Write a protein that binds this ligand. Structure first.
Ligand SMILES: CCCCCCCCCCCCCCCC(=O)O
Lengths: 49, 43
């Protein structure tokens, strides 16, 4: 058959799952340390006092 | 080795608080015992 001129140029692309904006949590300033450290600091604080 | 801590873990964490608070209350009783002795032995 004899095609006509392309009316839509395309190709092979890459599709991935759209990511999320990862809205920071309210209490995210605690993230640098683990929950165990934060809990142990309170225990250490009480003990020292 | 997701994990979580149970009540038995928090039973020893609560016991720590109760123990430190009892230790403080016992130290006050000791300071109270000696304060009375000093005050009685002053007048
Ligand atoms: C002076 C010693 C204590 C100073 C205050 C530190 C405040 C942090 C304690 C609360 C955070 C407990 C952690 C649970 C939340 C989490 O990180 O998942």
């Amino acid at each position: 058959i004899d095609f006509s001129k392309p009316f839509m140029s395309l190709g092979i692309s890459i599709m991935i799952k759209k990511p999320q904006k990862s809205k920071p949590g309210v209490f995210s300033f605690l993230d640098p340390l683990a929950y165990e450290i934060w809990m142990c600091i309170v225990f250490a604080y009480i003990g020292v006092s | 080795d997701s994990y979580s801590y149970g009540w038995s873990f928090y039973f020893g964490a609560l016991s720590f608080i109760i123990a430190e608070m009892v230790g403080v209350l016992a130290v006050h009783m000791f300071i109270d015992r000696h304060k009375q002795l000093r005050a009685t032995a002053r007048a």
